[PDB]
Design an enzyme around this catalytic site. Structure first.
Site, PDB file in Angstrom:
ATOM      1  CE1 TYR A  71      -4.024  -1.852   0.052  1.00  0.00           C
ATOM      2  CE2 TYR A  71      -2.730  -3.352   1.390  1.00  0.00           C
ATOM      3  CZ  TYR A  71      -3.805  -3.114   0.573  1.00  0.00           C
ATOM      4  OH  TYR A  71      -4.593  -4.169   0.170  1.00  0.00           O
ATOM      5  CB  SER A  72       0.865   4.362  -2.035  1.00  0.00           C
ATOM      6  OG  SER A  72       0.911   3.792  -3.317  1.00  0.00           O
ATOM      7  CB  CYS A 253       0.194   6.955  -8.472  1.00  0.00           C
ATOM      8  SG  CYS A 253       0.134   5.565  -7.355  1.00  0.00           S
ATOM      9  CD  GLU A 293       3.467   3.064  -6.192  1.00  0.00           C
ATOM     10  OE1 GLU A 293       4.623   3.025  -5.747  1.00  0.00           O
ATOM     11  OE2 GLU A 293       2.504   3.461  -5.511  1.00  0.00           O
ATOM     12  CE1 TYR A 295      -3.511   0.740  -6.926  1.00  0.00           C
ATOM     13  CE2 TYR A 295      -1.402   1.909  -6.923  1.00  0.00           C
ATOM     14  CZ  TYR A 295      -2.743   1.845  -6.578  1.00  0.00           C
ATOM     15  OH  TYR A 295      -3.291   2.873  -5.846  1.00  0.00           O
TER      16      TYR A 295
HETATM   17  C1  LIG Z   1       2.930  -0.780  -5.474  1.00  0.00           C
HETATM   18  C2  LIG Z   1       1.479  -1.043  -5.082  1.00  0.00           C
HETATM   19  C3  LIG Z   1       0.847  -0.084  -4.454  1.00  0.00           C
HETATM   20  C4  LIG Z   1      -0.504  -0.230  -4.059  1.00  0.00           C
HETATM   21  N1  LIG Z   1      -1.107   0.781  -3.433  1.00  0.00           N
HETATM   22  C5  LIG Z   1      -2.388   0.721  -3.058  1.00  0.00           C
HETATM   23  C6  LIG Z   1      -3.088   1.885  -2.375  1.00  0.00           C
HETATM   24  O1  LIG Z   1      -2.586   2.944  -2.099  1.00  0.00           O
HETATM   25  N2  LIG Z   1      -4.430   1.695  -2.061  1.00  0.00           N
HETATM   26  C7  LIG Z   1      -5.104   0.550  -2.338  1.00  0.00           C
HETATM   27  O2  LIG Z   1      -6.286   0.389  -2.046  1.00  0.00           O
HETATM   28  N3  LIG Z   1      -4.400  -0.450  -2.929  1.00  0.00           N
HETATM   29  C8  LIG Z   1      -3.127  -0.419  -3.298  1.00  0.00           C
HETATM   30  N4  LIG Z   1      -2.554  -1.506  -3.908  1.00  0.00           N
HETATM   31  C9  LIG Z   1      -3.210  -2.577  -4.539  1.00  0.00           C
HETATM   32  C10 LIG Z   1      -3.174  -3.443  -3.287  1.00  0.00           C
HETATM   33  O3  LIG Z   1      -1.873  -3.920  -3.048  1.00  0.00           O
HETATM   34  C11 LIG Z   1      -3.927  -4.784  -3.364  1.00  0.00           C
HETATM   35  O4  LIG Z   1      -3.655  -5.393  -4.667  1.00  0.00           O
HETATM   36  C12 LIG Z   1      -5.453  -4.533  -3.466  1.00  0.00           C
HETATM   37  O5  LIG Z   1      -5.775  -3.807  -2.280  1.00  0.00           O
HETATM   38  C13 LIG Z   1      -6.272  -5.738  -3.545  1.00  0.00           C
HETATM   39  O6  LIG Z   1      -5.784  -6.695  -2.565  1.00  0.00           O
HETATM   40  P1  LIG Z   1      -6.819  -7.682  -1.860  1.00  0.00           P
HETATM   41  O7  LIG Z   1      -6.068  -8.425  -0.895  1.00  0.00           O
HETATM   42  O8  LIG Z   1      -7.926  -6.829  -1.443  1.00  0.00           O
HETATM   43  O9  LIG Z   1      -7.270  -8.620  -3.087  1.00  0.00           O
HETATM   44  P2  LIG Z   1      -6.945 -10.298  -3.665  1.00  0.00           P
HETATM   45  O10 LIG Z   1      -7.776 -10.850  -2.588  1.00  0.00           O
HETATM   46  O11 LIG Z   1      -5.554 -10.734  -3.901  1.00  0.00           O
HETATM   47  O12 LIG Z   1      -7.700 -10.095  -4.945  1.00  0.00           O
HETATM   48  C14 LIG Z   1      -6.936  -9.688  -6.019  1.00  0.00           C
HETATM   49  C15 LIG Z   1      -6.908 -10.762  -7.036  1.00  0.00           C
HETATM   50  O13 LIG Z   1      -8.245 -11.063  -7.544  1.00  0.00           O
HETATM   51  C16 LIG Z   1      -8.254 -10.756  -8.948  1.00  0.00           C
HETATM   52  N5  LIG Z   1      -9.037  -9.519  -9.370  1.00  0.00           N
HETATM   53  C17 LIG Z   1      -8.921  -8.209  -8.915  1.00  0.00           C
HETATM   54  N6  LIG Z   1      -9.720  -7.343  -9.521  1.00  0.00           N
HETATM   55  C18 LIG Z   1     -10.440  -8.102 -10.469  1.00  0.00           C
HETATM   56  C19 LIG Z   1     -11.483  -7.761 -11.464  1.00  0.00           C
HETATM   57  N7  LIG Z   1     -12.021  -6.535 -11.720  1.00  0.00           N
HETATM   58  N8  LIG Z   1     -11.957  -8.763 -12.226  1.00  0.00           N
HETATM   59  C20 LIG Z   1     -11.453 -10.004 -12.031  1.00  0.00           C
HETATM   60  N9  LIG Z   1     -10.507 -10.453 -11.164  1.00  0.00           N
HETATM   61  C21 LIG Z   1     -10.024  -9.429 -10.392  1.00  0.00           C
HETATM   62  C22 LIG Z   1      -6.788 -10.978  -9.382  1.00  0.00           C
HETATM   63  O14 LIG Z   1      -6.462 -12.388  -9.491  1.00  0.00           O
HETATM   64  C23 LIG Z   1      -6.052 -10.263  -8.229  1.00  0.00           C
HETATM   65  O15 LIG Z   1      -4.747 -10.830  -8.109  1.00  0.00           O
HETATM   66  C24 LIG Z   1      -1.208  -1.447  -4.331  1.00  0.00           C
HETATM   67  C25 LIG Z   1      -0.503  -2.467  -5.010  1.00  0.00           C
HETATM   68  C26 LIG Z   1       0.788  -2.283  -5.382  1.00  0.00           C
HETATM   69  C27 LIG Z   1       1.481  -3.401  -6.122  1.00  0.00           C
END
Ligand SMILES: Cc1cc2nc3c(=O)[nH]c(=O)nc-3n(C[C@H](O)[C@H](O)[C@H](O)COP(=O)(O)OP(=O)(O)OC[C@H]3O[C@@H](n4cnc5c(N)ncnc54)[C@H](O)[C@@H]3O)c2cc1C
Length: 295
Positions: A71-72, A253, A293, A295
C-alpha cells in the site's frame, strides 16, 4: 538516507489501528478508507512516495498463509498529526462481479483493512520503494496524475509542500515551485480528500492547480465519460511545455492501463516540435524525472 526494509515479512512490526475513517461520501461509488496506525514501540521510518506491506490473517484456498499486499503510504514522514509516530493508508475495498464463480467476490487484504477496528494489531513490513520520491528542490514543478487510490503518494507530496504544520516542521523545504494535480474519480463524492485539496488551492493559487476528471458528471468532446487521459489531452500542450523544464518531475499513480492514454496525448504534443515522445521519456526515466506506479 532513504530507509528501506526496516521490517521484513519473517518478522514484521505489529502496529495498532488508531482510526479508520471513510473517505467516500454519500452518493459515491465504493468504499475507500483512511486508516491511521500507531508506530510507537518500533523503529519504522519512512519518507513521501514509499509503500509498506500489510500481511492479512488467514490462509488462501490451499491452506497456505496469506502473502503481503503493498500500500502506498498516504501520510508524510511525520504522520497526519505531525508528531512522527503514526502512518496512514488510503485503502479501497476491492470487490467484483457475479460472473466470477457465480456471485460478487471480496478482496482479502482490502476487506480486512477497510473493516478493521481501532485497537487492532496489524503486521506491517517495509518501507519499500525509491521510484516515487520527491526531490528536495523547493523550486521544482511537480505534475501529478492520480486515479482513485493513486492520490495517496500525491497527498504526501502536497501535504509536505503546503500544510502550515509541515512547513513549520521542515525548515529545509519551503516549496515555491508550481504543482498540478489531475485527479480522476467517478463522482464528486468519490473525490478523496476534496475539502483539503481545495483548501490548498485557495491558499496557494499561484503554486497549485487542481483539475478533476469526473466520469459520471462530465463528458469529453467525443461524448464519452471524462477520464483522466481526456483531461491530459485537453492540456497536452501545457503539460509538454512544463516537462521541457529541467526542474519538472512527473508522477503517475493509479490502476494499470492509465499510462497509454497519457503517452498518446503527449506524443502528439511533442511531435509538433520534431521530438519523439518515447525517446524523450526514456531519457526522463534515466534522469529520475519520470515516476510511475500503477497496479
Ligand atoms: C505498489 C502497489 C501499491 C498499491 N497501493 C495501493 C493503495 O494505495 N491503495 C489501495 O487500495 N491499494 C493499493 N494496492 C493494490 C493493493 O496492493 C492490493 O492489490 C489490493 O488492495 C487488492 O488486494 P486484496 O487483498 O484486497 O485482493 P486479492 O484478494 O488478492 O484479490 C486480487 C486478485 O483477484 C483478482 N481480481 C482483482 N480485480 C479483479 C477484477 N475486476 N476482475 C477479475 N478479477 C479481479 C486478481 O487475481 C487479483 O490478483 C497497491 C498495489 C501495489 C502493487
Amino acid at each position: 538516507d532513504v530507509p528501506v526494509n526496516l521490517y521484513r515479512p519473517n518478522a514484521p512490526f505489529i502496529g495498532k489501528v488508531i482510526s479508520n475513517e471513510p473517505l467516500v461520501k454519500e452518493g459515491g461509488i465504493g468504499i475507500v478508507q483512511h486508516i491511521k496506525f500507531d508506530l510507537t514501540g518500533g523503529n519504522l521510518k519512512y519518507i513521501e512516495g514509499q509503500s509498506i506491506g500489510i500481511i492479512p490473517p488467514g490462509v488462501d484456498k490451499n491452506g497456505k498463509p496469506e502473502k503481503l499486499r503493498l500500500y502506498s503510504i498516504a501520510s508524510t514522514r511525520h504522520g497526519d498529526d505531525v508528531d512522527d509516530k503514526t502512518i496512514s493508508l488510503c485503502v479501497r475495498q476491492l470487490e467484483y462481479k457475479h460472473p466470477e464463480s457465480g456471485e460478487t467476490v471480496y478482496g482479502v487484504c482490502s476487506t480486512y483493512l477497510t473493516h478493521i477496528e481501532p485497537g487492532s494489531e496489524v503486521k506491517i513490513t517495509g518501507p519499500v520503494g525509491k521510484e516515487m520520491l520527491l526531490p528536495d528542490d523547493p523550486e521544482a514543478n511537480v505534475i501529478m496524475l492520480a486515479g482513485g487510490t493513486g492520490i495517496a503518494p500525491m497527498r504526501t507530496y502536497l501535504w509536505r509542500m503546503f500544510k502550515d504544520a509541515e512547513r513549520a516542521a521542515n525548515p529545509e523545504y519551503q516549496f515555491k515551485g508550481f504543482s498540478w494535480l489531475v485527479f480522476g474519480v467517478p463522482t464528486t463524492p468519490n473525490i478523496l480528500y476534496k475539502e483539503e485539496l481545495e483548501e490548498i488551492q485557495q491558499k496557494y493559487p499561484d503554486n497549485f492547480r487542481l483539475t478533476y476528471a469526473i466520469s459520471r458528471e462530465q463528458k469529453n468532446p467525443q461524448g464519452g465519460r471524462m477520464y483522466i487521459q481526456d483531461r491530459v489531452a485537453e492540456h497536452a500542450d501545457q503539460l509538454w511545455q512544463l516537462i521541457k523544464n529541467q526542474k519538472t518531475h512527473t508522477y503517475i499513480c493509479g490502476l494499470r492501463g492509465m499510462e497509454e492514454g497519457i503517452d498518446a496525448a503527449l506524443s502528439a504534443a511533442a511531435a509538433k516540435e520534431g521530438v519523439t515522445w518515447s525517446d524523450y521519456q526514456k531519457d526522463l526515466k534515466k534522469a529520475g524525472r519520470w515516476h510511475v506506479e500503477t497496479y
